[PDB]
Amino acid sequence: KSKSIPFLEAPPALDGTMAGDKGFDPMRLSEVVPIQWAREAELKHARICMLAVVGWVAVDLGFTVPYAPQVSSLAAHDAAVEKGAFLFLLFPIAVVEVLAGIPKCFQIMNDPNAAPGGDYKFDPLGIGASADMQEKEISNGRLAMMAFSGIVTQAALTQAPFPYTYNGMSDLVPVL
Amino acid sequence: ELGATGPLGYWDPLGFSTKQPERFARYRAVELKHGRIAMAACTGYFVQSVLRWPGYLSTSAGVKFSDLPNGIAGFAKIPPLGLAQIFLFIGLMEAFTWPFYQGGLGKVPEGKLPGDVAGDLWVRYSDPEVKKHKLNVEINNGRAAMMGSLGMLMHDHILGTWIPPG
Amino acid sequence: PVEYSESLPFLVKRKALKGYVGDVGFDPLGFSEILPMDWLREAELKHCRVAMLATFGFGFTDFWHFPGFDYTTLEAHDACVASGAMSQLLLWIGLLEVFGTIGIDQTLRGSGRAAGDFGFDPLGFGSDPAKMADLQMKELANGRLAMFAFSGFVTQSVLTGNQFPYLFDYQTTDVFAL
Amino acid sequence: AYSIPKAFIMMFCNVLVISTMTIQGKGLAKGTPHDEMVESFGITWLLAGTALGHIVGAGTILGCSTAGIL
Amino acid sequence: AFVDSIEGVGEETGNKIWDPLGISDAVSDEAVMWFRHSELKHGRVAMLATVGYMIGAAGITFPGEIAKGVTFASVGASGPYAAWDATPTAGKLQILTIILALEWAAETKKPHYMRGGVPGKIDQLPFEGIPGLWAPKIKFWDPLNFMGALTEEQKARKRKSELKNGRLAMIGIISFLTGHNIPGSVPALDSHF
Amino acid sequence: AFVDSIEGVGEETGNKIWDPLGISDAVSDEAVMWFRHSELKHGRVAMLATVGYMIGAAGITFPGEIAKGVTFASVGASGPYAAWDATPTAGKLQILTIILALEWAAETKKPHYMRGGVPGKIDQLPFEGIPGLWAPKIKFWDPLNFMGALTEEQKARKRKSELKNGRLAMIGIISFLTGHNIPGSVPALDSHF
Ligand SMILES: CC(=O)O[C@H]1CC(C)(C)C(=C=C/C(C)=C/C=C/C(C)=C/C=C/C=C(C)/C=C/C=C(\C)C(=O)C[C@@]23O[C@]2(C)C[C@@H](O)CC3(C)C)[C@](C)(O)C1
């Protein structure tokens, strides 16, 4: 029985070696998608959403680079596209993806002796790849995914400052 | 062991029957009674939302079946004689037709099931598995119906219509 | 034992790049698996050398030019094609490249010649075998730098319209301001 | 999705397709249990079922919109 | 802890468990521990709230200003009740934030009151041991450490007095609020409430 | 390198390592070497910068011309902070060029502060051993060899003094910058700042 859903049996592929494992796979994607591919995708989305959340919050608070538009994060995409300097953020993304994801993706698909998904060996400071720091990475990334989804769909809906709620801190704190 | 299946198996988060297993039969009787009245009330709400009887509710009064709303206001706009007739009908049906307790409180029939109040003339499933499944769906529908009926009652108390704002 | 690239340590080594200078394992797209290393390295050295000469010549012509050639770097190609001094380069470099294709054909067939070795070493730099490997690595490093250098030279020159530095007008002032 | 009628129609079409579909002679309408379908076919049972449910839902929604019923 | 494994029986009810509904008798010991913890929390909040209205009705305020744009006297010009609204939004946000931190810490202490722990004994040093967090070791309860001079037999008596005063306080705070709302509900209350 | 082995503990925090957060205990060994080298670099940069800012605020400036048409008084007339914008771009270009050279040369030395080198020990004579490069053997640290007349225990005492002065220096330089940006945030900064 899975630890997360106590009325279903966990898949055999999940086991307990992977970081962030909680037996949560009710519809068993792990049989139709390789777990390493799924983990690489999970970590990629998690990292992109962490960066997106912190960048959105910074730009909304007002942290702006010189010569850039002085706009909120909701209109920042359109403003940057109009002003021009937004393809040079795609260019490093282009080289990183084409020269690290495609080879790593084909290694995960084909090679048996390949690094696990989301492992680029990126440890400049040597902080450590412990299983505590992988669990923390995964938990923060999942929280950032949900938080970014909420932030975008609330900012577009309400068109308000940082809280992205209609009333403000009053909705997070009804006592106010 | 009837009642207990589903997403959550036994579910006694305060341990009532665990502390007092002798009272499980009484609690089952009360649950079945509440579920039955709840299913009746929910069906009444759904069917009164769409269909209203044609005719005078009382010749002495000026009130038709169509003027009543579907809620506390609808129940309020009934003559006291009609309300008394409803009350005594429920009283007879619950005291002489379907008495859950043979005698006093906490004295449900040991030979019969806790909610076995129907007489000889009733639908009976002579199969243990089918009987168990049908009783399980009975009690589960009772639970869902009474939660939903509390929802309807609170919505109609607050706004006036059982359906809440969309 | 599994070999990982020294440049992409999350990928397995190609295993086709063994026994070559500048072998940090940079080949994510696996061109060595398909094409032969001799052909690929001959192309690399040709690009390196032509790019070194090009990046030096672009900057040099931005400053000095012969009396007959009064053209800027950008219009020099068109002006000299019209004059006929690019045909005189394509004829005397095409002769060199005819000999070069004979050479690369021979080394791909297994004559013994290396990928980019022509034997051209008049002044004797690196005639000692100990210094030849280091000088080959330095050649590759400088050439691979010069490729990007020439690319930046041409692109920034056309983009800015400025002669030597290839910098916008605002970049010559207040570029270290808080 | 915008309209509650549209959501109701799409949900009903998806449930009807999932109930009445049959893969290799196995289906809920043909008295195959949910657990056996889940083990035999996996999430391919939901993916194909909901894909055709969306196709038939689109067909009926567009037809009702054309007819003015919606 | 259990039906009789918890103090709080007094001579007012003849040293008997005053449970007309029989809730304590019916629910399990885990629910009894939950109920005791909630009882003590309500009693403590009420002992704070009752003396915090009494001061509001008396009209005593700290000299000075609560913020640059509003004064301690300005915030309580509307009698006790209409004071929380008058307080600065950032101020009440900070108060609720620290209360949230205390509540979450007390819940995250491992020997939970339900699952094998003392009911009513929230940990006296919250925020200690949280990774990636530092706070001064200011003991939440008795920072001056008045407990070192008391024996266990005295602590039992003081816990009994705590429960009795707490119960009286939750009666009293509701009485004061009901007197403020309904004028003639509770006698012996002046117009300040 | 490893936290217990570093001369970082002082008498300010009870002769104990001061890591309120769980950083040093969460990071591996070489991350601490990186952090210590970074601490020393920040401390020394701010230790020079605070003195430079004080001199600029005081207005003590060299007698002469920084360029053929610009005076040190002219670039300092706009206060200590705007002097960086006032100085010629072609001069701060040379300053950043030599800083680039020093940083790259310090990073290129083999043992490496993360790979078995002393963190915070910038190698003396950074421009030696470099092919295709000559520079006179003027030591980056102590060019007059003041350290020669010091003992190892005295040098350890002075390393501790260096750290405790540098930390205060970065506090001071951020104080100056925040005092300029947000007015009145840091008192003791008159209009000259
Ligand atoms: C007597 C004889 O001889 O034979 C009989 C014997 C026997 C056995 C009795 C038979 C039977 C079967 C019978 C009579 C069964 C009757 C069952 C019955 C009458 C069951 C009601 C359920 C109601 C529920 C669950 C309500 C949920 C309500 C919910 C979920 C809600 O909250 C409502 C709501 O959320 C909505 C939906 C919309 C939202 O906007 C919000 C609101 C809150 C408004 C036979 C075999 O047929 C014949």
Ligand SMILES: CC(=O)O[C@H]1CC(C)(C)C(=C=C/C(C)=C/C=C/C(C)=C/C=C/C=C(C)/C=C/C=C(\C)C(=O)C[C@@]23O[C@]2(C)C[C@@H](O)CC3(C)C)[C@](C)(O)C1
């Ligand atoms: C053996 C032993 O020792 O113990 C055993 C035996 C013993 C003691 C007999 C037992 C018992 C019986 C107990 C304790 C039973 C408890 C029953 C309970 C607690 C029943 C609540 C109903 C609430 C309703 C219907 C609310 C409607 C609410 C409605 C319709 C509203 O809308 C109210 C409204 O305010 C709103 C929400 C909003 C306002 O805008 C509008 C208004 C004002 C209208 C136990 C548990 O078995 C234990």
Ligand SMILES: CC(=O)O[C@H]1CC(C)(C)C(=C=C/C(C)=C/C=C/C(C)=C/C=C/C=C(C)/C=C/C=C(\C)C(=O)C[C@@]23O[C@]2(C)C[C@@H](O)CC3(C)C)[C@](C)(O)C1
């Ligand atoms: C009457 C009379 O006299 O008329 C004369 C006078 C007059 C008018 C002056 C004339 C003229 C003009 C002439 C002759 C002009 C000549 C121009 C020429 C020959 C211009 C070379 C540039 C070279 C560059 C930019 C190289 C950079 C190279 C670099 C960046 C390096 O140092 C690379 C480096 O790797 C080293 C090498 C060593 C390493 O440790 C360090 C690094 C890695 C950095 C004439 C035509 O002669 C006529």
Ligand SMILES: CC(=O)O[C@H]1CC(C)(C)C(=C=C/C(C)=C/C=C/C(C)=C/C=C/C=C(C)/C=C/C=C(\C)C(=O)C[C@@]23O[C@]2(C)C[C@@H](O)CC3(C)C)[C@](C)(O)C1
């Ligand atoms: C009360 C209040 O609020 O105040 C406000 C206002 C106030 C006070 C202004 C503020 C501030 C700023 C602060 C705190 C500034 C601090 C600045 C600081 C700490 C500046 C160190 C410089 C060290 C140097 C240059 C060392 C050179 C060292 C050299 C050249 C040597 O090597 C000397 C030596 O080699 C010899 C020659 C011989 C050897 O035998 C011995 C040694 C090796 C030793 C605040 C923060 O805003 C607070």
Ligand code: KC2
């Ligand atoms: C619960 C079920 C139920 C049963 C089993 C039942 C049986 C009988 C029998 C047979 C034994 C007779 C003979 C009879 C006769 C009358 N019933 Mg009655 N009745 C029931 C329910 C209601 C309700 C809800 C109302 C009502 C009424 C009347 C009126 C008045 C008419 C008028 O007002 O002109 C008359 C004459 C209305 C009322 O009291 O009106 C003041 C009214 O609202 N009844 N009713």
Ligand code: KC2
């Ligand atoms: C028990 C709860 C509690 C705690 C633990 C706590 C801790 C700290 C600490 C930590 C060491 C700091 C550094 C700090 C600082 C400030 N607090 Mg604060 N504070 C608490 C409660 C209140 C209330 C009720 C108010 C308040 C305020 C301010 C203002 C005024 C800013 C201004 O004038 O704009 C400043 C600067 C007032 C306010 O928000 O005024 C708009 C206000 O009404 N605080 N407060």
Ligand SMILES: CC1=C(C#C/C(C)=C/C=C/C(C)=C/C=C/C=C(C)/C=C/C=C(C)/C=C/[C@@]23O[C@]2(C)C[C@@H](O)CC3(C)C)C(C)(C)C[C@H](O)C1
């Ligand atoms: C039809 C109609 C009308 C009507 C009506 C009528 C008669 C309505 C009757 C409604 C009725 C009879 C509604 C019962 C609800 C009971 C509920 C929700 C019980 C929840 C109980 C719960 C959730 C208990 C849970 C637990 O115990 C569990 C399981 C285990 C323990 O460990 C833990 C706890 C204690 C948490 C009007 C108004 C007259 C007029 C209108 O016009 C039309």
Ligand SMILES: CC1=C(C#C/C(C)=C/C=C/C(C)=C/C=C/C=C(C)/C=C/C=C(C)/C=C/[C@@]23O[C@]2(C)C[C@@H](O)CC3(C)C)C(C)(C)C[C@H](O)C1
């Ligand atoms: C090294 C290498 C390769 C290469 C290469 C490359 C790109 C080499 C390039 C060489 C280059 C660019 C060589 C220019 C010479 C210019 C001369 C001699 C100019 C004469 C000019 C004369 C005689 C006169 C000019 C006039 O103006 C005068 C003075 C008077 C005016 O009235 C008019 C005229 C026009 C008459 C390979 C082969 C591609 C691959 C191999 O792997 C590596």
